[PDB]
Symmetry: C3
Subunit: 436 residues, 3 copies
């Protein structure tokens, strides 16, 4: 039976130790005071730091970074041991080197393996290890690195190796972030959802309050969110394929592909996926508000008054078959536009994305990507034909609130149509392999 020593008897050291008592390991705690250790598991003795290190071959330091100073007092004991640095930091970039780098310079005669810093001690005690399933392992001594990965499987966890010790800077950044790449699409949507909210409140509850003075203020329950959400969903969709357009152009002015993109497009290259999933969220709301239109009391009432007026006044509707096209046109364009818009999202799962080579993935995300962007653009152009862009439409001096959202996608579709022309596209073909 193996023997595993743990320095520090605090929060993580109790929880990790009590897991290993249930997994068959001689757990030998080391604390500052072997006299008084109140909360401890049953079959695990507590010794001194110099005492407990002389018994195991695997030593886990469950202490913070600042209290590393006593380890230099015992570096002749730690010769050839396997030290498992598990520590984290309070915030990103607090120190110029990582802990495992800093731990290796404190004890040069021992092998350092970064591990366990992802999971939480409450997940070990409660056993509800759901997101804390993988354990990242990085280090330099490969033979000692395997012995750590023989422990982690016996804890019911999953070891994911991360290579050399140079990756330990990245791994400590991992459990401290809270949606780092989603910060740009959240702020970009929220500044566009608030602005479009106050834009449409002016058209739809203020203008009926100034002229033909009636309340009409229920519109911000469903109808104004049914106007904010799809234009948010359309603009963020057009913002996805816009760096693909710009960097295509920006390769032409340079005439090569070996120079660096100007670092503001480059973060906006990495946030392509982050935008498209946000655009999926708003389009899914625009679906659900639309399918629930015939339950709304304002829809039920207006269909009542329009019918009874046609009932008591003997005039009738002649069934204009032109309008029978259009009202069935954009809907059928919207469903085809939405189905692909789901199909891009199902591709975005990290398990579907790992089962598909990059040629098929380029076919889904780029060849079918514009095909979504067309059918979403045609869904609002055909709906725009019923409004026809008349001068009887703008209320004071400002339009019907969707044509502001049509500036961006029509810009992309025209310029992409330039880039498919053989006067340009054959130049694109040679420049993807090397050109002056």
């Amino acid at each position: 039976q193996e023997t595993v020593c743990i320095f520090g008897t605090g929060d993580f050291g109790r929880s990790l130790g009590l897991k290993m008592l249930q997994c068959g390991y001689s757990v030998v705690f080391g604390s500052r005071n072997p006299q008084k250790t109140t909360l401890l598991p049953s079959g695990a003795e507590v010794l001194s730091y110099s005492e407990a290190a002389k018994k195991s071959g695997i030593i886990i330091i469950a202490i913070h970074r600042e209290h590393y100073d006593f380890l230099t007092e015992l570096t002749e004991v730690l010769n050839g041991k396997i030290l498992v640095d598990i520590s984290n930091n309070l915030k990103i970039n607090q120190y110029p080197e990582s802990n495992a780098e800093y731990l290796a310079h404190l004890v040069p005669g021992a092998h350092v393996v970064k591990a366990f810093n992802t999971i939480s001690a409450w997940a070990l005690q409660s056993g509800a290890l759901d997101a804390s399933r993988q354990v990242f392992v990085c280090g330099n001594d490969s033979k000692a690195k395997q012995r750590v990965m023989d422990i982690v499987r016996n804890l019911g966890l999953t070891p994911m190796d991360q290579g050399s010790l140079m990756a330990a800077k990245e791994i400590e950044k991992y459990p401290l972030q809270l949606f780092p790449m989603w910060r740009f699409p959240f702020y970009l949507s929220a500044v566009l959802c608030v602005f479009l909210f106050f834009y449409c409140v002016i058209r739809d509850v203020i203008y009926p309050y100034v002229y033909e003075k009636k309340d009409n203020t229920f519109r911000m329950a469903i109808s104004i969110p049914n106007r904010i959400f799809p234009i948010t969903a359309l603009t963020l969709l057009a913002l996805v394929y816009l760096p693909g357009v710009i960097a295509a152009i920006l390769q032409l002015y340079r005439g090569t592909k070996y120079r660096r993109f100007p670092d503001w497009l480059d973060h906006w290259m990495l946030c392509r996926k982050q935008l498209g999933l946000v655009a999926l969220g708003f389009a899914f709301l625009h679906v659900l508000y639309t399918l629930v239109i015939p339950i709304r009391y304002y829809v039920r009432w207006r269909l009542g008054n329009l019918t009874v007026t046609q009932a008591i006044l003997k005039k009738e509707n002649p069934f204009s078959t032109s309008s029978a096209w259009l009202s069935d046109s954009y809907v059928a364009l919207g469903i085809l536009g939405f189905f692909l818009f789901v199909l891009l999202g199902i591709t975005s799962l990290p398990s579907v994305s790992n089962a598909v080579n990059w040629r098929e993935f380029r076919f889904v995300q780029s060849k079918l990507g514009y095909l979504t962007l067309i059918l979403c653009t045609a869904h609002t152009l055909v709906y725009g034909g019923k409004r026809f862009l008349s001068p009887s439409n703008l209320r004071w001096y400002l339009p019907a609130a969707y044509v502001l959202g049509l500036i961006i996608p029509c810009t992309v579709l025209v310029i992409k149509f330039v880039l498919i022309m053989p006067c340009v596209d054959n130049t694109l073909t040679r420049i993807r392999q090397g050109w002056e």
Copy 2:
């Protein structure tokens, strides 16, 4: 070219052997009778047990547990061999030790590796290995364990290592279960779906049969399932966050977190995920019945009679703008409540859950979890305002059938609101790190 011996020529031994003939291995079968072996692949000879063991270094025993007795007659031949125990059992807990433990005590001079017990022989023959893709490997001799994992990759499979031989008790439990954790939410929903079915049949087809005697019995096609399913979906949602409430309280009476939960809450801690996915199933039905309301003939007819009555009788509806709030209120609360209720389900995928650290996962599942539970509670409270809880509502002595489903969630929301108060929440903060 390597040589792989297989003891037993039955069901699995033919299928595993015929796979290895297509993968380039000298397959040497051993049976009881090398004379008569009718069904066998082409390039694989059949020898005796003592004969075939003297040729390979890797020996696979495709025999049941009870017919292990002849192996003691040849334990001097199996010195240093690699024995791959693949056997399963008829039911859980049939024997006090696992097979690989029991096999190691029969032959102490050989290394045991548990493998292959997950996949099926028909998946090997037909090549439609879809769910039988991973192969679990556990054992003690690490160098022999790698040589087994060099075979499994050559079969087009995926080796998942499981650590020491102590995990072999768990691995044989794996292919024998049939949704073990889903057993509690199935029974809890079914006893709540049947009870709520007979509860609403009494209100909706019995009471129109006693008083104002008319048929009205079509309601159990859609309308009664549109009443069973969301209250089932709401109660099972409130049952998710209820152990989080109770164990928060139960940490306060103890004043520490280092004592064990009382073993009936603990299984109901592990079945949190299992409930929430079932609540996603019923809420998704309550969506689809609701969106298809305007196609129902009973909905089309009642809208006809209400209009024609307003047509021939010249009275009209004055468009009560208070009702224009409420009917657009709970719908907009329901869509926001459903969108997050999907977003918890997309998080529950085992690939999305492995790409997210536990801080973000706690933010989705717990910070946004109650935010779903509020908006689902407000979706039925606002719908409850249209019924107003009047004495003209209960039929005999029993209410309008949703307020029975409001006992559980409002209980959770009040007590959780207690736990966010700083008179309690600051005590929660110190007790998550250690306290008397």
Copy 3:
């Protein structure tokens, strides 16, 4: 610090080298001309082929297959080196042996490891490695194979080992295909979608143009796609479980299970999953056209004319409660039929499929699979009861266009009902273990 040599300085060699400069490796390029090398990273010298090979231990050949000829001129330099063949081919089956096999016969005194052939050089430069995340590694020398997998983790990638060098034929087929298994369901659906399109155009816009001459040509916007898509979705669903029926029968005529299926059923065994996901796509469209019926102008108008006619003519509808069953019957059958039809798709994810043993997977895909096929068949039979199959239905000599899609599923349901009978099913039980 390690030293990694790269033969060839072209497209991939620049991109792979510039990644390794950012990851800490002495990159030593070899080209034909060390004099003129214009585009190169900063800290990486360019030497001759014989010169650069004398410095590293790991040599990557970023050259095509045809320009392998100079390697025989320097095979005494490559003794014991680790050669990483990364090359691809222009099309499948261009040569009888793979590159790594062909490379090993050119240099017998070196170890060959196939790697890196999946990812693209633009993903390395741009850093948007999304689908090009995994790197497949296969080879024979296991100790040299690990040293390659120590490089790949330092590039931020994920090494997936593939076993011996015999798998290298398969790996080069991987990045060249473009949905290979989806080719059969695409063509089978498209030949069934076009045929059913021209079939229903004749019934629905031609017959109103011949008799009772009116336009009626808007029907091919939504209504004709609402007739093509579900019958496409139903037939492709019945085509899923049809090989399961036929091969069950075909085991009975043989009386064993150890003979090979006749190679046209066998490809149609592997394309089970490929069909069912396509049938999920068309059923999801038939959902979305159906839920958007009450927004169509043709639906709004016909409900207007039917009401006003019932308004001015004092006759009324007596609320036939038989029709109140049926219109609420097939809808409730369709929703139950669709919910399971989603639940089969959620199972089809490669991460959910790897978390479920084959007994539960057989219970979802086969026990609940027919339960979908029943409820989808009953969804159109009950809708067929409203049309009743009258002689007042067929227009010239041809029926109401869905009963053509009912030939296949009712065939499967009857013959499967034969196979559950104990006169047959007990014979099925013995024949799955061995029988004459």
